[PDB]
């Protein structure tokens with residue numbers, strides 16, 4: 418196994434078409450729709466991209482996947498009932514900017530009646546409060562946790578974890594920016610490039626991303642200073658935008 | 671301006687306050703309360719957070735409370751016994767990172783040996799379950815990462831390569847952890863502990879040195895080291911019998 422190999426958009430779409438025909442042969446009238454997502458769904462696949470497909474099933478509670486390789490390429494096909502998929506499309510977790518681009522990159526190849534459009538409409542109709550709640554949770558569950566981790570590094574090591582942690586913090590900041598602007602990143606490779614192009618960023622985020630994007634992550638004292646500056650920027654930014662809960666009680670339940 | 675420095679004694683006082691609040695609020699629905707993470711191992715450092723797990727009698731109970739006081743952070747998970755036991759027996763690609771929880775339980779309340787049952791379930795997973803998880807990890811994570819860095823080589827962007835190299839090093843550490851059936855003690859020690867294990871895929875140690883040193887700016891070298899690690903994976907699976915099925919064009 419030395420793949421993935423170089424492939425063209427034909428070669429991927431021919432494979433997609435074979436999988437579509439197999440899906441219709443096996444599941445028949447239980448298939449409501451078949452779509453391609455990811456880079457191939459956006460028609461921006463590169464020489465080595467994988468193949469990602471989504472199937473909407475009429476079957477109650479249907480929820481399964483097939484993910485395999487031929488040694489030369491890799492495919493993932495998800496099969497979901499309409500209710501299960503629409504519920505997922507309306508959920509906003511901390512990595513929503515990374516996961517839900519799927520629903521804004523659908524290439525419809527089979528649809529028995531407006532199913533893929535309903536998925537898209539569901540993904541785009543999330544209410545403002547849902548994003549607000551997700552942002553407040555991200556600050557506590559990810560950023561505050563990371564701040565404790567790098568401050569532990571400062572006082573007790575290990576600095577060998579600091580480059581990886583700095584990458585994680587830059588990614589969490591990108592999730593924060595994506596939730597705030599209600600944008601999903603096109604690919605994993607463009608997350609940081611797209612994040613630093615947005616407006617109204619927390620102070621210090623650009624400098625942090627400069628280390629991560631250049632790969633100059635060996636000066637631990639500079640990384641710690643950059644992380645602290647970003648953490649200070651988070652405090653001013655969340656206060657300015659109202660992403661604040663009462664934290665005065667030791668136990669808030 | 672937090673998190674602040676705290677002592678283990680201070681953290682345990684907070685834990686016991688939370689224990690009393692859980693018993694006051696949820697009463698006889700509480701089967702057990704435990705501390706996990708660094709505090710559960712009694713190796714918490716100056717800035718560590720507080721992580722607690724509760725076993726509930728309510729069927730389908732699955733919720734959490736996660737908050738900060740500005741100065742420290744607490745996460746409390748509440749699960750029914752079956753939900754927790756089911757999760758404790760599942761081996762996903764990040765099992766070496768997630769299931770250390772079940773080998774770090776400090777019981778602080780237990781009405782019927784429940785936390786011991788959780789530990790026994792986590793430690794009794796069969797060898798085939800790890801074999802399946804390793805084969806899935808190669809297909810679902812490592813093969814995907816290989817396509818991503820090969821795309822970078824031909825079309826960019828190299829600005830993603832440091833982050834991707836960190837991800838690949840972590841995925842390799844998961845592979846090693848699944849093979850040796852070990853859970854890493856802390857998030858910070860994953861890479862240091864992984865490269866000290868036996869049976870490493872060739873090229874993995876060298877790749878990790880870039881990630882641990884933070885020397886991630888030489889893009890040609892990272893790409894060469896990623897390819898060498900990917901080749902090391904192909905031997906490593908053959909040597910240890912983790913054979914991935916590549917015979918079906920469409921496996922359904």
Ligand SMILES: NC[C@@H]1O[C@H](O[C@H]2[C@@H](O)[C@H](O[C@@H]3[C@@H](O)[C@H](N)C[C@H](N)[C@H]3O[C@H]3O[C@H](CN)[C@@H](O)[C@H](O)[C@H]3N)O[C@@H]2CO)[C@H](N)[C@@H](O)[C@@H]1O
Pocket residue numbers: 455469480484493495496497501502505516519810
């Ligand atoms: N399918 C719709 C919904 O998917 C959910 O699961 C989501 C998520 O956990 C799941 O993640 C799955 C894993 O599991 C599996 N072990 C490997 C697989 N590559 C990964 O796939 C996902 O993560 C990759 C990056 N890491 C992405 O590249 C990929 O596009 C994405 N589908 O993919 C789903 C998102 O597409 C739930 N299953 C359910 O709410 C419902 O079925």
Ligand SMILES: NC[C@@H]1O[C@H](O[C@H]2[C@@H](O)[C@H](O[C@@H]3[C@@H](O)[C@H](N)C[C@H](N)[C@H]3O[C@H]3O[C@H](CN)[C@@H](O)[C@H](O)[C@H]3N)O[C@@H]2CO)[C@H](N)[C@@H](O)[C@@H]1O
Pocket residue numbers: 558707721732736745747748749753754757768771
């Ligand atoms: N609790 C037992 C089981 O946990 C599962 O979820 C697991 C996982 O998704 C979940 O992850 C949760 C997130 O969700 C939540 N939004 C933020 C929270 N800090 C994070 O916590 C987890 O990830 C952190 C590192 N990032 C770890 O430091 C932390 O110890 C760990 N509990 O924590 C659970 C493991 O403790 C399922 N909920 C369910 O099968 C059952 O409840």
Ligand SMILES: [Mg+2]
Pocket residue numbers: 558562745
């Ligand atoms: Mg946590």
